[PDB]
Amino acid sequence: SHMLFQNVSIAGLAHIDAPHTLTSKEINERLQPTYDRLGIKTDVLGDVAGIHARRLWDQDVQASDAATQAARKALIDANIGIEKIGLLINTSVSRDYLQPSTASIVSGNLGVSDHCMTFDVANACLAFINGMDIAARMLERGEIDYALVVDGETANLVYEKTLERMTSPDVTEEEFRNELAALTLGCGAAAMVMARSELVPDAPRYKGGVTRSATEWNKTRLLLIEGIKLAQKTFVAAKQVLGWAVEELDQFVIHQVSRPHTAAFVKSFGIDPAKVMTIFGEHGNIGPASVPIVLSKLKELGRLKKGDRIALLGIGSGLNCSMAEVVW
Amino acid sequence: LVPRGSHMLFQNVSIAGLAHIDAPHTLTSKEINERLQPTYDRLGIKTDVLGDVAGIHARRLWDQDVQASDAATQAARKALIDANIGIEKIGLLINTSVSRDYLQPSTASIVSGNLGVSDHCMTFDVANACLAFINGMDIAARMLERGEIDYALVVDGETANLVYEKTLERMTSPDVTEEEFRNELAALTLGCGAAAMVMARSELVPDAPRYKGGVTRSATEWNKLCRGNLDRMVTDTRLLLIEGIKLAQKTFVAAKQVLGWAVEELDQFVIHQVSRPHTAAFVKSFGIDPAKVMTIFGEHGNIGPASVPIVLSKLKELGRLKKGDRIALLGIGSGLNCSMAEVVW
Known part of the structure; x- marks a missing residue:
């Protein structure tokens, strides 16, 4: 019955590691006064969740900037110029604005042609695979030769606000315990070039x-x-x-x-x-x-x-x- | 005479059902201009930039507690009635609005939960400003044409209450500049509403x-x-x-x-x-x-x-x-x- 995709390929791929390390030891030293003013005594991040560090971007890196950096590296991996790109989909949770699409901002940064379709997909952690499938369907139908699927994630604000709240004199312990899961988020970016198989x-x-x-x-x-x-x-x-x-x-x-x-x-x-x-x-x-x-x-x-x-x-x-x- | 290809246009894709919801509360440009008048006066604006230049006489708003997903859900139930199908037949649900309940999960997942979609139903949001409904229709059409699903819903709920409230505050400040006033005036041309469409394989309809x-x-x-x-x-x-x-x-x-x-x-x-x-x-x-x-x-x-x-x-x-x-x-x-x-x- 069901036919899989037979002419869809992955021409290039890349990732960007964000450059600032924030260790869970460091977070716990900042939260110690609160942890104790609540007799919390497990290291929940490091011992339970198993997160020992995460990476953060420079000040005011936006999702679009991170996604741009990944895209350029992916285009190098694929050995193609931006002018071959017919579709750019952004799949991040982090987005610069409600509108326009983060994709349009990424696309504008890269200098995509006037034939390039762009839009964002949002679906929590599955959106990159959704974007890949979306792009696959267009590639298969012959609408485009090459697609870029991009995702930049920023967590800098979420850390600032979450650690600012948690160390307040008013903070309760019911708060803390879900506020902690925000402390498992990390920054990073990835991009994929997909293509019609006869080209690659x-x-x-x-x-x-x-x-x-x-x-x-x-x-x-x-x-x-x-x-x-x-x-x-x-x-x-x-x-x-x-x-x-x-x-x-x-x-x-x-x-x-x-x-x-x-x-x-x-x-x-x-x-x-x-x-x-x-x-x-x-x-x-x-x-x-x-x-x-x-x-x-x-x-x-x-x-x-x-x-x-x-x-x-x-x-x-x-x-x-x-x-x-x-x-x- | 000369065999020609399809130009990649969609084959055997149909619109099974369509509906809209008009938001209930009317906000006239006349009231807005009464709130803005002291700022118009200070900036020397003597023309009715809403009613006479933009050509907007009224817009509709929801109550403050209506989320994008709630509007979209209302429009989706009506489109299902228009298509005479039950929610179990839907294989794809895409939400295309600018307004969104949360950064995550998608607004589509909320609407889908509200409606009771099957465990086979694929759902995600698409964002592309004012074009996104068309993008959604195209994504669904690709699946329908290939025969991977029978029916799709594309939904969109827009809520402009907050932008109106905060824009009107900002643009009534005694200190707002001419440049800021001009930058933000188009916000006062937005409106609330919702729409939904059921797309289907043409064989079925x-x-x-x-x-x-x-x-x-x-x-x-x-x-x-x-x-x-x-x-x-x-x-x-x-x-x-x-x-x-x-x-x-x-x-x-x-x-x-x-x-x-x-x-x-x-x-x-x-x-x-x-x-x-x-x-x-x-x-x-x-x-x-x-x-x-x-x-x-x-x-x-x-x-x-x-x-x-x-x-x-x-x-x-x-x-x-x-x-x-x-x-x-x-x-x-x-x-x-x-x-x-x-x-x-």
Whole structure:
């Protein structure tokens, strides 16, 4: 029945690590007076979540600037000039304005042609995979030759405000404990050039994927159990559409909320943890950029060889779950 | 005679259902001008820049507690009724509004939750200023044409309460400058409303309108011309007009090539509107007959990406559209972008 994409490729990919380190030891030294004025005595970031550091941008780097930097590096990786780009999609959570699209600002920075379509997709942590699928569909129909999918994430403001609130004399302990999860966010950026396969015949192939949703929960631990339920449904669809079995996939590129979230996931599906690269420990949760930043690292480290079957997945707020395949 | 390709236009994609919601509270330009009068006086403004220059006499607002997702949901339930289908048939739900409940999760996921979509339903938001509904329609059409889904919903709820409240405060300050007043005045041409469309594979709805898609051009060097956040919009009206017309000329050339358009053969032009004199300039530039151009701007203002489907819905409910009518969907959006697409009723 179902036909996958047969002429969609990944011509180039890149990531940008943000340059300022904020360690969890440092955050905890700033929060110590509060932690004690509440007899909190676990290191929740470092010991439970498993986040030892995250990166922050320079002052007033906007999402668009970070996404621009990643795009230029991706265009170098693909060996193509901006004038070949027919579609630029931005998929970040961080956005400069409500309007215009962050994509238009990125596109303007790069000097895209008057034929270049641009718009933003928002879907919490799954939006990069949504953008890749969007772009795939246009490539397949012959609308464009090349597409850029870009994502810049900024968390500088969220840290400033969250740590300012938490250290206030009024702050309660009910506050603290959800205010803490904002402290797992990290900065970073990624970009991908996709292309029609006849232009880049040796490049990795994007096959497509599946999505399942549980939007009864659009409003922590329940959500770890409910995300796993939804991922199980999604794997079943992936079996039927993609011909998946766990044992044959070479890498699982996942979205990363926490160490215990990842460990539950790998345990529930019987996946070899060695096939699951994580960067949360040093970068935190980089939202929808996490998946392409991990794939880019896998690439840059020489971990991917021709014919490797790569799963790209996550569980994102909604709840939604998407799983897609690349053949390297 | 000569075999020709489709020009990448969409095949066997239809509009199964369409609806709009008009926001309930009227805010007249007369009241707005009474609040602004002391500032008009101080800045020496003697013309009615809203009612007489922009051509907006009223706009609608929601109550302060209505979110984008709530408006969109209302319009989605009505479009499902129009398509005579239940929410279980929907495989894709895309939200296209400028207004948004949260940075995350998407507004689409909220609407989808409200409506009770199936676990098979794919949902996400698209953002592209006033063109996003068309982008949404195209994304859904790609899936429908390929046969991956049977039905899609594209939804858009716009809320302008906050921008009105905060703009009116700012523009009534005894200290506001002429330049700031001018920068923010276009905010007082926005309106509230909502629209939703059900798209389907044509096999399932053989008498329904067909959506062909169309063309897009951009001028992203002009991306600073109009910028908005939750409570403020700053716009260079003058350059938006000039650069928008230029862009639209380029995009009409493409439309001739791809859609076969000549202005005189179209039956209706559904045009996104920013002001009466920008609309007059656009219709005069391109030789369009003004009787083929429905306007709701005077009483509802500029509803952003919802404007085009709201006008299409009102044309449907007026009985203005007959089978075989060729309807052009046109807009210039902040970016700058320009899209032109065709519906065959």
